[PDB]
Amino acid sequence: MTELSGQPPKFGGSTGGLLSKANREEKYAITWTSASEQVFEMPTGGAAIMNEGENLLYLARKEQCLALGTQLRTKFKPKIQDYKIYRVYPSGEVQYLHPADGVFPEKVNEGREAQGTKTRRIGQNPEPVTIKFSGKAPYEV
Amino acid sequence: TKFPKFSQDLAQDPTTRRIWYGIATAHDFETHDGMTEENLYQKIFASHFGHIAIIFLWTSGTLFHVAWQGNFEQWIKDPLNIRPIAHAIWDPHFGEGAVNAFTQAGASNPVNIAYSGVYHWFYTIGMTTNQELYSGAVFLLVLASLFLFAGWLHLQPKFRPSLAWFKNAESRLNHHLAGLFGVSSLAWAGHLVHVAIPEARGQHVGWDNFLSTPPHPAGLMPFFTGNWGVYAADPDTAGHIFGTSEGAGTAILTFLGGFHPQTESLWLTDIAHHHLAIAVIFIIAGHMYRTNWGIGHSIKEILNAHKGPLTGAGHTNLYDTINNSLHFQLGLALASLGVITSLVAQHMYSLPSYAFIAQDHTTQAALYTHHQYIAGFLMVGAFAHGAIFFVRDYDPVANKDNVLARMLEHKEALISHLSWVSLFLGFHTLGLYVHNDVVVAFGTPEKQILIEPVFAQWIQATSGKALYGFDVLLSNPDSIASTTGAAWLPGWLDAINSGTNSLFLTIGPGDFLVHHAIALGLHTTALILIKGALDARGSKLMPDKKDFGYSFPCDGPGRGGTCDISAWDAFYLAMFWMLNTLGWLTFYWHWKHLGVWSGNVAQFNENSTYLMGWFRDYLWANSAQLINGYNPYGVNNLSVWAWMFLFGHLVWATGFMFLISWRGYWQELIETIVWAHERTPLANLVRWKDKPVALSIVQARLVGLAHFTVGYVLTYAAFLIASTAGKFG
Amino acid sequence: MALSDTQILAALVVALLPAFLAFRLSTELYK
Amino acid sequence: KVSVDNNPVPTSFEKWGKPGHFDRTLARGPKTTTWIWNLHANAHDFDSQTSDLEDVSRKIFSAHFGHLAVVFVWLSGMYFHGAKFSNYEGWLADPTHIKPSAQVVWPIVGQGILNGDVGGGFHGIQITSGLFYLWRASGFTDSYQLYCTAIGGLVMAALMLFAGWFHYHVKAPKLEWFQNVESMMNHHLAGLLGLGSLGWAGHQIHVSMPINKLLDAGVAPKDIPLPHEFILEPSKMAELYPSFAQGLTPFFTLNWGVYSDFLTFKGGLNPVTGGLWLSDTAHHHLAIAVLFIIAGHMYRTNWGIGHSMKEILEAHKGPFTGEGHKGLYEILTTSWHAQLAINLALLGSLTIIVAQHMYAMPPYPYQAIDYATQLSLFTHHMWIGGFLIVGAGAHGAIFMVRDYDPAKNVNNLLDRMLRHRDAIISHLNWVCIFLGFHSFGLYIHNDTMRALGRPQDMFSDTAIQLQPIFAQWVQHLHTLAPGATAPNALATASYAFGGETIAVAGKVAMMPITLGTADFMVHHIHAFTIHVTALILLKGVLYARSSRLVPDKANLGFRFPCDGPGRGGTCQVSGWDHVFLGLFWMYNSLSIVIFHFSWKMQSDVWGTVSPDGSVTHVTLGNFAQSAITINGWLRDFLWAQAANVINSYGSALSAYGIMFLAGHFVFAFSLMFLFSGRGYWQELIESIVWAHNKLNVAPAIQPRALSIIQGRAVGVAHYLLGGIVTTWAFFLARSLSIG
Amino acid sequence: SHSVKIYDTCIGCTQCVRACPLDVLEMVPWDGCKAAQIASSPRTEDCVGCKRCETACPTDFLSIRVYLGAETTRSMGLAY
Amino acid sequence: LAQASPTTAGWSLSVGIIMCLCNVFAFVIGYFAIQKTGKGKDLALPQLASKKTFGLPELLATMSFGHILGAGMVLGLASS
Amino acid sequence: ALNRGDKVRIKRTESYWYGDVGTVASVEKSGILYPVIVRFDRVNYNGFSGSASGVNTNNFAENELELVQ
């Protein structure tokens, strides 16, 4: 949370990456620890070279960061499970995203509430004329 | 707030789809937030008054144009061999060749020949001068201003009507049957009695003499006491000449029938007597229900007491649905308007009621296909709004075991059997045509299949025709219905058996085949709209159609693929079928009347059985005078129609744009273009305030369909007007 | 027969007022 | 260095039962009707079924052998059709008077009307492929020889089938024989491209020269006997051309001057027959034979001398390029798809070259007599080229999806491509906008000006001229060239560049083609359409792996419809749909080029020539005034030339009109597939299923809808076929009745 | 935001959380199934509507449903 | 006509000063063109001073090149 | 309530498999929401675009099925 320790990967730079929204509204970042030096592909186009130790890389959307993360899971023979996702604001604040608890959402850990979990079947949705001329919708209620 | 203001859901994003959808949903008042019955009905009433204002101002504008820049009185001097004028042309880009090719009909400025056919209307009502047309224009203008002022007046807080006033159905029906349809027809009947009949016979009626001159030598008391035959004493004979008095009696009400022997028109006495009789019948019909007196009927009692043994619950509790669902009654109203406009179109060519309208073929053809396209549009919209009613306003608990519940139960068999009728009819129509095609391709027309439409000649003969010789029940004097002694028999029997009018044309096998093609288009389009409506609340692919709304893009690549699943997409595939069925109708009508007007009916009687003459005799040969609107030598008056023809062709392909290619590729392209705008020097000093993006799937589909429609109608209108004007100028 | 310039100006000055009161209607119907 | 294996997969009959055993999920059976389309879809995609290159490459080899077998069956059938059931001798006795024919029709349902009077005492249907001119140039004069060719081709097609069965089922080579691409290149430049050139050089020297040299004089075809008694008897060569009597001694002593009697550099055309000089083609084939035999000694295979591809690809690297072409050899000797894209692209462009050299320099005798064979041959070769080049784009895209490895291409050229793909698409969009506004805008302006009838500010010869000075300058240079810069060419390279009118018996063959402003605007239209097609296929290749709309789309595959209605909508993001629209753009561009070809050479170079020196075109020279606009394009080319199509009925050409109407029907039926989606008709099919369940005649295999990509495929197929068949009907119907 | 709702007919196959590439679903304990695990969506304001979730689950008219509502350029999927 | 007129082999000048020195130059090139010579199937066992020293395929390659280069010499030299 | 091997008919009306019969597979412990796992012979719509096969097994409860045998 303090600072993003690492190094930009050995790359020749790409013109298909960050845009003015990166310095204007928000932009993304991802860090990981590499067991050994090898080569990967960066989701905005091209192949980059990671280095052993901490690596720092910046992106602009969540799709790119999670595609890269799934690549570092399911491409390399020594599996990497040490990638964290960060978002930075131009005001200088940083925020952690995932995994917030520290374990993947594929499995189950305690200390968690369940929300958006309605206890009714498909046909037990309220029929729309009882919601007619109200601010809500049948899917919300 | 930021535009659009009426929904915070559309004011939360910087994308340009916000702008597109803010243009898109400005009339969907139900989707608006903070929305009740009171606000909705008040905006309804305001928008209705605004539309009536648009109607009357449009009529005032066209009337002012035909008054000022037209050639009305020089057409009064001779009404047959002079083309009318719509308005002059103000365009600085005209070279002198086009100026010489457009300044015609005795004018000094370049003008356009009017094909709207309002000249015959203003003649047959009797607007003999331009000053009177100016008075009419200013009168409808101040009437439109009156509706504007009333529309603003009713939206004050003190004059906003209550919910129950809009709810009171019985008073609305009694008023609209009596005080809208009856007394207006009485007024128009009086207008024909006291203005149109004397101006037709020649004697002048001004704005200071009508209170003095009587419309009949006898008074009102023969109408009162015992003898209405005084008004049916001296009709205008067959030797009558319009605008003068030789062979002209002074009867106002008679029903001799037939046509006008001079100009092939309906007698104005027939129209006046007819309007008066319809006025009587609607004034009687306007007193059905109880309003405030206790005498009459109630909608709820009649609609609930009609039960059934095997119907189910009959029609119970429907009144609560139709009165509390605007979409249902809107669909009924639009369906009634569509069928009545189809009847307008298909009755105006056969039994016209205007002087010299049977000669100017361009106006007749244009007006027929005008009202026919209007019919198609309005009543496919009726079907679409019925589908929207099923989406949004159906009540399962209020309509338990209702007739609509039975409809949703047997919708499967209904859709299946629309499909069966469509396939049977289409297979045999196409098979008959292609067998005729292959047979005449080898030079042996004796093996063609020419099915005589026996029922068509049967109804022709029982309606009065004696050419086919079936002589059943009307033309034979031996039947009991011939010696009825009615006053329409000689005029009608003259009208049917005279080979110079378009009424009850001679029918051949090509008419049988093309009528089967029309019935095919009908049944296909009906299948499309019915399965779009009846399956809008359930499908084994997606029974959650009521949850998502009415117009949604898809439901994803899962479950095998869900593209084009909404009822909006059913309308999307419906519109092409509507346009095609209208097209088949209009090609058949135009080719048949070209054959009749040319006098060479044999080419239609022989070449219509096989596609060759459709594609060659009509679609190829009649296009020759179209395209020569500008030869490399010079131009003529048909330049604008040909250039608009090519214009509509380009519109058709430029909508076939959106009708082929979908979103994601276009999104990648426009995103790369955004990157181009980003890194370039001397162009970062200005940045957009609204984010650019590709159109949505539903919006792209809509704009492709709209382009298809406008290009289609533009090309057909241009070809029809130009070819009909070229052949019979 | 002949037209007059005063007729065209009279039509224009009677047609001005539906435009003004329709502007007022569009102003009031924005809410 | 060969390495083979014995009996890798033995023959059986049981695998033909239970079809679909190649895949793992298609073998359960017909549980739904989509399984049939899945079976037909992946029946040739052998790459994704197995893993290693070994067995799949054996399958490819056997598949090539099957393809050579089937094309050999087709060629043997065509030779037998031309042999027994044709008019080859009756046509060969005369020249321009009698139209040739190579097909008869059974009179069954009135088809004898189609079997019209072709001329020369026969009733049938007219040929237009041009095989008669080929057989006259080769030296065919008897039906028994053609029957021998047919039976030999059929039996060696059976030989090819046996060879394929052997090479897959008995002896299959390893990988190690395949990557030896140096031996591939050396043998293909040496053996295939060289021995055929030498063989046809011998055929033209020995057979074509005396046959045509006596046939142009006026000798009847049944007077002279066969070429074998020529090759036995050298005195006929000696009495015809005295250079044969000197023997092969001047060849070996390099005194080739005496050989110029029959090995010439005449150039131009043949005024007797309208084709090219056969001596010129013999000299051509010998020269290209020498060139290819020299070219087949580039590469190192087993004896030290030559070159290696790895070294030469490492040897090139630039200051602006980086490390250079390292890595191309692995990805281009490992993935079949990259090489397929290369060969398909160059084959498509080569076919375009073939047609563009056929039309202006007719190589075969009597080709320029009838315009139907010329026009039809040109447009057919162009359509083949368009199909092949779009397929090359498709397979380059699928290579970038499937077989590309990001690890072995660090800082490579493909890395730079995927690095500035956004820039390449950007600047190609800008040139697309440029040629769109500045070429079609001229036509819109010209049509608007002609709509006002003011030609003083038009774009024409009689108005503001956009004169193609470069093409006219190169034409003038080609006219001046054979006198000054080509000393050993007495005539010109062609009269199509410019020169004097060359006529033939009765008709005209080729005149110089003047280039006005209309051709300038047309060439700009061409460059614009080619740029659009290049844009869409180039993006479909480059954006096929990753993009910042969806980054993980390569994990899905190559053939996927969409990624849901999210992100605003992701319909047609994959490269398959890029190809699906590229087919439409190919269709549009080639329709324009063949319309311009037909109208320009119907207006300027063809017609009837009078003996006094004047010519008379069929359209009387309207291209300089009616092709400048677009409404004139609609009337003077489409309406004017459709009359021969739509007035041929009851005559001998009713079939062309029937195909014309059927092609319009197929085009209209394609809109089925293009416009609507899937769920609408899957719902409709389900209602039909309920109806059939009511009768208890429900099918065991459950009926389902076509998939979205399947619907797009069938749609572009029907649209494209409808366009091709109606264009074919119009072209043959117009250009056959010209006479 | 693209609202996502999950109903009470979940088995617990955990393909539902496995397929979504935006890390919005999460798998929470429960007691009404054999797996004793129902899925949930605690971060709904960053799923874009890709609807791969609706393809993932093999139950008949699957427990999870996504709905397209008020959109934001955060959830519209742009790089600018 | 004016074609490039060739002559027969005079066998005194046309073969000696033209292509024999060209074969000599081909041997000179073969001294400084082939990076790797001696691994052919036959190694050309009878070595010599400077003529048959490296190997068979180098010898045939340089002799074929001498032939083609001398043919070019005698054709492009005689009568321009 | 139902045992293994029962040929049972379903009446949910919100499923594709309405008006169908088939064999129940297994019943798990009491207190669970949907105990009755049924096996059919047809297939529903499940799968990606152009998928080879969907699913044929789903679990329901007692209060919407009807035993026939």
Ligand SMILES: CC1=C(/C=C/C(C)=C\C=C\C(C)=C\C=C\C=C(C)\C=C\C=C(C)\C=C\C2=C(C)CCCC2(C)C)C(C)(C)CCC1
């Ligand atoms: C979508 C929907 C819907 C629908 C609508 C519609 C569209 C309707 C219609 C309909 C129609 C469209 C109708 C029509 C009709 C007519 C008829 C049915 C008729 C008849 C018959 C008869 C009986 C006749 C008689 C006669 C004769 C015999 C001849 C002469 C004349 C007379 C009259 C005499 C609704 C909204 C409701 C609801 C929801 C869904």
Ligand code: SF4
């Ligand atoms: S909703 Fe379906 S896919 Fe998601 S966890 Fe539950 S059973 Fe699995």
